[PDB]
Amino acid sequence: MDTYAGAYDRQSRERSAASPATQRSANEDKAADLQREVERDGGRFRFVGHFSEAPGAERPEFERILNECRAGRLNMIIVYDVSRFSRLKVMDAIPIVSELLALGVTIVSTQEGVFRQGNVMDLIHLIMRLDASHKESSLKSAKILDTKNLQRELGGYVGGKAPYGFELVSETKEITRNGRMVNVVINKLAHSTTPLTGPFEFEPDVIRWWWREIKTHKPGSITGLCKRMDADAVPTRGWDPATVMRILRDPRIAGFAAEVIYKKKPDGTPTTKIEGYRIQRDPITLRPVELDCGPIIEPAEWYELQAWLDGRGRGKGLSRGQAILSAMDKLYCECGA
Amino acid sequence: MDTYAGAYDRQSRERENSSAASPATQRSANEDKAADLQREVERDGGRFRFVGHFSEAPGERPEFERILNECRAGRLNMIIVYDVSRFSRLKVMDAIPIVSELLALGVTIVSTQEGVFRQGNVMDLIHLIMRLDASHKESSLKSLQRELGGYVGGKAPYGFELVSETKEITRNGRMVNVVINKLAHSTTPLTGPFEFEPDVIRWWWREIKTHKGSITGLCKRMDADAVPTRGSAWDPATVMRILRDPRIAGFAAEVIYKKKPDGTPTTKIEGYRIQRDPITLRPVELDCGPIIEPAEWYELQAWLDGRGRGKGLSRGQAILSAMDKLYCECGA
């Protein structure tokens, strides 16, 4: 009952996916969770660290971690997603995951779950769903792409001004489109570093403060926060309760990519007023897509915050069970809409 | 350069591949192929030995396991089969893992009907098997059972009983009646201090729930208070397996069993997959309704996770953990 685990990370070949840094962070958090469970259950668990391929043997770190598994020194590999095992197309991961599982290795995908020899066919069927997806993304990507669609394709922020808490930072992508090497400048969201006037340094600090005031109080009202902000000279992007709540509803503060939903006129033409947000999700797992800049408020805290706002909106706080059930209900509506 | 080759043959199961190919036909093609390969390897300076036929008795698969184990030990490095479908257990797709393992060991697979496969062209084999899978799936549609929202299984799970119901079906303009079993809350009168099995389940939550109490404690109390096991002591693992059951929250679910290395399922429950609407992802509700209300059930799952991790979850962590379980279910 001894688990020896390594993690493997590498950049995507472009053709969704996170940075090595994002992968390593999820991988080590997963390792810490697994360790607690195994130890609770009497066993032993050792995380030996990250096998990280250099951005550029084509895959010497991958070969190293696989050889440790073949020699029986590791019996678990953690990856951000099962696609990391692939070389050119996701389908070509099938032989190597089959070999690993037949050796008794457990594969843990942070995004997709746990796979062992017992459930190897679950992994095979997963990889094929990923293949069928991706093939569908390819067809869309093969089309003629306008400015916004190209920006979306490259992980770029479509929009005028960065939302509160954030700033826009430019980045140049080297793309090959129809056999032509082309450079495209995109904007990515970063945590705002604009120096503010009053008692908080940057916009993220103001946001974290709002949650600190609300959580710990049983200020601690949103109107109260606004009156305190005006008195303490917290600058207003040059305070309305509706604006504060609109920001607290923004999934991007939790590090989740999201579409802003605007209020539409009877005509159907959108106004400039924000109605709400739709979290951007992986098409197979439904897991939220993560912004490269990471969270302003950790996801766990953000979900607690949303439950708090819902309890205020309903005029009654939710039990822990009702909070879980309500979060599920919001997801089922996002899906049905 | 040395080749050690065995051949493997077995009758078709009723599954879809060359059935006309009797074992005798397979063996004859297999040994003719071996003779051809031998000539070629020897022309080319190498050495080749055919060790004979591994032939499964017309009926789990001891000769198959034998030839695989000889490959794993390095005593054979080639398997000759009439067709790649021989490697499969139930569906042709399930041949993928075993051929992948064999090729990663340096084995050459020679299919008399389909060609030669090694590690260097493993994807050719994978793509072939999938084309065969896609083809049987299309053959299946063309042409049985009552898997249409009826409980498929022997005994009702703890908390429940089986009640029969008639579904009125019209299939291609023909009226057919199909008798199914549906899950109902158990009404079997119990011995001890609780009336029915649902009462015992609700009691567990009452004893455990953290408002501001252990599973081993519940089991010791149950034995003392004479709470009957279905029918011989209460096992903590069993209590938790039941508390994990989404059906007790009124949600339809598939039971996931622990599989042998082979892939063949055991009778041991590994977990559950909530059945969901394909568009909204909302759980499909059992007609009989919840034993424990959904809100309480989700709280219970967070409580079990906190016990499993050895540390209680914050409210946020509980929400995030429940989401994480859903994201894994969705991909399956």
Side-chain angles (χ1 to χ4, degrees), chain A, chain B residues 1-17 19-143 145-332:
Chain A
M1 215 175 184
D2 214 319
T3 298
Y4 295 96
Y8 174 74
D9 67 272
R10 66 160 176 80
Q11 280 183 344
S12 300
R13 303 175 297 266
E14 290 282 314
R15 303 204 180 179
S16 167
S19 73
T22 300
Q23 293 173 49
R24 283 193 294 272
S25 178
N27 289 346
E28 69 194 18
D29 291 356
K30 179 57 71 177
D33 291 337
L34 287 163
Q35 179 160 337
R36 287 187 224 100
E37 290 178 329
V38 164
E39 291 175 348
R40 162 72 183 175
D41 204 51
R44 294 187 191 283
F45 185 106
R46 174 41 185 193
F47 179 51
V48 187
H50 299 287
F51 294 74
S52 300
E53 300 272 25
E58 180 66 20
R59 298 175 81 196
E61 292 298 298
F62 188 56
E63 290 312 318
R64 250 159 38 74
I65 199 175
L66 297 177
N67 287 346
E68 292 307 300
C69 290
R70 295 170 178 138
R73 288 185 292 268
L74 292 175
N75 59 17
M76 176 178 281
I77 297 189
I78 301 168
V79 284
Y80 181 71
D81 62 26
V82 293
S83 166
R84 301 307 130 174
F85 289 100
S86 70
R87 183 176 151 269
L88 272 160
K89 298 289 188 167
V90 65
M91 197 88 105
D92 77 30
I94 288 170
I96 189 63
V97 305
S98 298
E99 184 190 354
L100 289 164
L101 291 188
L103 290 167
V105 181
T106 299
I107 292 172
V108 179
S109 163
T110 300
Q111 305 295 269
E112 295 134 335
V114 185
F115 304 93
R116 306 191 176 83
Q117 207 169 358
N119 72 322
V120 64
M121 293 308 288
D122 292 351
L123 189 49
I124 301 317
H125 291 118
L126 172 57
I127 289 159
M128 286 166 71
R129 292 188 63 190
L130 293 158
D131 172 271
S133 200
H134 191 287
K135 278 203 68 163
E136 291 317 275
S137 288
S138 300
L139 281 154
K140 292 185 85 197
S141 293
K143 295 285 166 306
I144 295 173
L145 294 171
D146 72 8
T147 298
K148 291 196 160 77
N149 288 335
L150 187 56
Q151 290 291 335
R152 288 168 197 290
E153 184 65 30
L154 296 163
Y157 176 75
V158 177
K161 285 176 286 223
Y164 189 74
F166 302 86
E167 70 190 6
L168 299 181
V169 304
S170 59
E171 167 179 317
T172 300
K173 282 255 179 158
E174 212 181 344
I175 196 165
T176 306
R177 229 201 92 161
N178 296 106
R180 200 164 275 175
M181 283 170 81
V182 167
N183 278 237
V184 182
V185 184
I186 60 166
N187 281 315
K188 279 225 160 37
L189 281 165
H191 297 171
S192 175
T193 61
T194 306
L196 300 179
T197 326
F200 300 105
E201 190 177 10
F202 307 121
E203 292 180 352
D205 301 311
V206 172
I207 293 171
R208 281 188 284 265
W209 171 66
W210 292 340
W211 178 229
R212 213 178 295 123
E213 285 295 337
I214 288 170
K215 191 190 174 93
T216 68
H217 282 79
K218 321 220 170 178
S221 149
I222 292 158
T223 42
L225 282 180
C226 290
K227 298 228 288 162
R228 184 70 81 185
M229 281 183 105
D230 291 307
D232 296 339
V234 183
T236 64
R237 201 172 202 69
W239 276 101
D240 170 19
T243 299
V244 174
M245 289 186 285
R246 160 177 66 75
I247 295 158
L248 288 171
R249 291 296 195 183
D250 190 349
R252 293 164 304 177
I253 277 64
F256 299 153
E259 183 184 26
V260 179
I261 313 298
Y262 291 95
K263 292 176 179 176
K264 290 128 204 155
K265 298 195 179 182
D267 188 32
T269 60
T271 67
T272 64
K273 302 185 177 190
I274 299 183
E275 174 172 310
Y277 307 88
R278 191 183 321 290
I279 297 181
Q280 182 183 336
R281 294 174 179 282
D282 183 274
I284 289 177
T285 63
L286 292 206
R287 195 169 293 268
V289 179
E290 288 165 21
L291 298 173
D292 293 339
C293 62
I296 290 173
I297 292 178
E298 295 304 322
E301 297 295 327
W302 186 80
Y303 276 106
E304 198 167 302
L305 163 65
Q306 300 318 297
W308 183 77
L309 293 158
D310 295 342
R312 171 197 177 97
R314 291 188 333 96
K316 185 100 292 179
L318 296 178
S319 69
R320 176 180 279 211
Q322 288 170 335
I324 296 162
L325 197 61
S326 169
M328 291 295 166
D329 187 74
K330 283 178 184 182
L331 166 46
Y332 307 144
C333 298
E334 280 180 335
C335 288
Chain B
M1 209 311 302
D2 306 80
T3 301
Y4 305 92
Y8 175 72
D9 67 283
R10 67 160 176 81
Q11 69 182 346
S12 300
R13 291 280 295 187
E14 171 278 319
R15 94 209 183 295
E16 328 214 308
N17 217 285
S19 67
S22 71
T25 300
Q26 293 172 52
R27 282 192 294 273
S28 179
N30 289 348
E31 69 194 18
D32 291 355
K33 178 57 71 173
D36 291 337
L37 284 170
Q38 179 162 335
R39 288 187 223 99
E40 297 313 313
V41 165
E42 291 174 349
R43 266 135 178 175
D44 205 50
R47 294 188 190 282
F48 185 106
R49 188 199 175 200
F50 180 52
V51 194
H53 298 287
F54 295 74
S55 302
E56 299 272 26
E60 186 68 17
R61 299 176 80 195
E63 292 299 300
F64 189 56
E65 289 312 319
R66 250 159 39 75
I67 199 174
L68 298 171
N69 290 341
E70 291 308 300
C71 290
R72 293 170 178 139
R75 289 184 293 268
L76 293 176
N77 61 9
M78 177 178 280
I79 299 186
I80 300 169
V81 289
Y82 181 71
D83 63 26
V84 295
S85 164
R86 302 308 131 175
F87 287 98
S88 69
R89 183 183 60 96
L90 271 161
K91 297 290 188 168
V92 63
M93 192 87 89
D94 76 32
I96 287 176
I98 188 64
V99 302
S100 298
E101 185 190 351
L102 289 164
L103 292 197
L105 291 169
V107 177
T108 301
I109 290 175
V110 177
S111 164
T112 300
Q113 304 305 114
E114 294 135 330
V116 179
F117 306 95
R118 303 194 171 83
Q119 182 58 22
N121 70 322
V122 60
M123 293 309 293
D124 293 351
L125 188 45
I126 300 314
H127 286 116
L128 172 64
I129 289 158
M130 287 166 72
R131 182 194 170 194
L132 291 175
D133 172 87
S135 194
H136 306 333
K137 279 203 67 167
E138 291 317 275
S139 288
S140 300
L141 276 167
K142 296 186 86 197
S143 65
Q145 62 198 5
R146 46 165 194 100
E147 189 192 27
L148 54 137
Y151 182 80
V152 272
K155 286 174 291 304
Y158 189 75
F160 303 86
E161 71 188 8
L162 297 183
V163 306
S164 59
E165 167 179 316
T166 298
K167 284 255 175 256
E168 288 181 343
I169 295 313
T170 305
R171 225 208 323 156
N172 297 111
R174 183 169 273 286
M175 285 164 283
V176 175
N177 282 357
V178 181
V179 186
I180 61 167
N181 278 324
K182 279 217 320 220
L183 282 166
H185 295 172
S186 174
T187 61
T188 306
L190 300 174
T191 326
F194 301 105
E195 190 177 10
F196 308 120
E197 291 180 351
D199 300 310
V200 173
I201 293 170
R202 282 188 284 266
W203 171 67
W204 291 341
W205 180 228
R206 215 178 294 122
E207 286 295 335
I208 286 175
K209 175 175 175 95
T210 304
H211 293 81
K212 302 282 163 177
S214 151
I215 292 161
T216 312
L218 282 181
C219 291
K220 299 201 278 164
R221 287 187 170 188
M222 280 183 101
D223 292 307
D225 296 339
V227 181
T229 55
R230 210 169 220 186
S232 310
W234 273 101
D235 168 53
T238 297
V239 171
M240 289 188 296
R241 160 179 65 78
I242 297 157
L243 288 170
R244 291 296 191 181
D245 189 350
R247 294 164 303 177
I248 80 190
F251 298 153
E254 182 185 25
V255 185
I256 314 299
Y257 291 96
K258 291 175 179 175
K259 289 128 205 149
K260 299 194 181 180
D262 189 32
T264 60
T266 66
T267 65
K268 301 189 61 50
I269 299 182
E270 174 172 310
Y272 307 88
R273 190 184 321 290
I274 296 184
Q275 182 184 322
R276 294 172 180 282
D277 183 275
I279 290 173
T280 63
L281 292 196
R282 195 171 296 273
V284 181
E285 286 166 17
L286 300 169
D287 293 335
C288 63
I291 289 178
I292 292 176
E293 295 305 321
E296 297 299 313
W297 185 79
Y298 276 108
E299 198 167 302
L300 162 62
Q301 299 320 294
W303 187 99
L304 293 160
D305 295 342
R307 171 198 177 283
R309 292 188 333 97
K311 185 100 292 176
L313 295 168
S314 68
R315 176 183 271 213
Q317 287 173 326
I319 293 162
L320 202 55
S321 168
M323 291 296 165
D324 189 72
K325 284 177 192 155
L326 167 45
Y327 305 144
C328 300
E329 282 179 338
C330 283

